[PDB]
């Protein structure tokens, strides 16, 4: 059974028939930076581990670890994981890594989180990271999904941040949220690549145009989504970097392959 690096589910919350979030106890010695991912999983029928990469959806200070997950019909992990219940366990490898970290960027004045689908997961972490509002004056969350229902987890998160009297102040008109659908009717629509290139996002939010001097960005989507967004960023004069030589943006795959 689930014994290796076992942690315990403390809460579960379903959002759509393809999306759910959950939280589990944190390993005692685990330390990470907001944005990083880890390996989790469950045993298959024969007792073999089914391991998968997951961004930690909670910020570094949170006492429990949060995850925002797809539900793949017939997906080896999530076909099983979607039916997880409080009190049940999961395997968790306490080896955080990744390049969606503030340290992997040149310091600047504005920070952009550019995501689609479950790619908002590392930004559910980072948007709740103190350092994000310390090192930057403005934090822009662009989230693009096909439907209004897929935006809800993210929408509730940002609502909680903007309303809470304490955080609401600490995040003093710094956090800007721009959700869009690409298929379903919604007050705000369009692909991140198009809304960034056209300059429409700037008019809607009422913000200064993208500037390589000051703007820094993180991209988390399908490989296809990362490619297109890289181009638009580079058109603005921003260059890809990392911990080795930090520049103005970083990208990570929300998953491998084509996507649900
Ligand atoms: C760096 C990294 C971070 C990741 N973070 C998350 C995360 O926080 N939340 C999460 O749900 N998944 C995340 N993924 C994907 C995750 O590792 C698994 O692929 C996922 O749990 C589904 O596993 P499965 O075995 O059920 O399906 P798989 O056998 O892994 O894949 C089945 C198919 O479903 C599609 N798919 C898989 N994951 C997604 C996704 N998240 N969104 C849309 N389509 C998908 C792909 O087309 C894939 O071909 C991440 C992947 C990487 C590489």
Swiss-Prot record:
Annotated ranges, domain FAD-binding FR-type: 2-103
Record-given protein name: Flavodoxin/ferredoxin--NADP reductase
Cofactor(s) of this protein: FAD
Q: State the reactions this protein catalyses.
A: 2 reduced [2Fe-2S]-[ferredoxin] + NADP(+) + H(+) = 2 oxidized [2Fe-2S]-[ferredoxin] + NADPH; reduced [flavodoxin] + NADP(+) = oxidized [flavodoxin] + NADPH + 2 H(+)
Q: Does the keyword Transferase apply?
A: no
- Keyword check for Cytoplasm: yes
Q: How does it assemble?
A: Monomer.
| Locations listed in the record | Cytoplasm
**What Enzyme Commission number(s) appear in the record?**
1.18.1.2, 1.19.1.1
Which GO terms of the molecular function aspect are on file? ferredoxin-NADP+ reductase activity; nucleotide binding
Write out the similarity annotation.
Answer: Belongs to the ferredoxin--NADP reductase type 1 family.
Q: Which organism is it from?
A: Rhodobacter capsulatus
Q: What does this protein do?
A: Transports electrons between flavodoxin or ferredoxin and NADPH.
UniProt main location, coarse = cytoplasm
Q: What is the top EC class of this enzyme, as a single word?
A: oxidoreductase
Gene Ontology cellular component? cytoplasm
Q: Which residues bind FAD?
A: 52-55, 68-70, 76-78, 118, 254-260
